[PDB]
Nucleic acid binder design. Structure first.
Lengths: 66, 66
DNA sequence: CGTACTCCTTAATGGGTACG
DNA sequence: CGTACCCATTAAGGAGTACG
């Protein structure tokens, strides 16, 4: 499990998720649609082997990823 | 926003949420139904004035509550 | 790559009642 | 309180196709 394997946009999403934001907010913050946010979240989760955005959030925090 | 206003059961659930567990898992871990878990979750979310379990997860890690 | 859809399914949430 | 259900909704996830 390494954050470097993700793309820049995917890390953009991960950062906002670890800050507890729902997809709709992430989209507005990034000026992209929720649909696109969902694609990134999905890719990030499969590539990081996390089961959900919460695991993703807890990971970032415990492993001091950002 | 203080963790002491919550009940013991509620803190049990928040601790498990902060570890990234979904309601179904929390229920199996505590040996209660998902229904009861959800009740504890929404109560906790209203008392702590948090919008979602992710916020609760991030809050717990930032404020090093556990 | 990142954008933005389709479709479908499951998780999560917010309100209510009830009762040892 | 803690348990457990009812109702209803939105949020989230997992797959696919498409295109500059």
């Amino acid at each position: 499990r390494d954050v470097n394997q993700l793309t820049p946009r995917e890390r953009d999403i991960l950062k906002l998720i670890a800050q507890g934001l729902p997809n709709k907010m992430i989209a507005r913050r990034l000026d992209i649609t929720e649909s696109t946010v969902k694609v990134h979240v999905k890719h990030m989760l499969k590539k990081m082997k996390l089961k959900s955005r919460v695991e993703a959030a807890v990971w970032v925090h415990q492993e001091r990823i950002f």
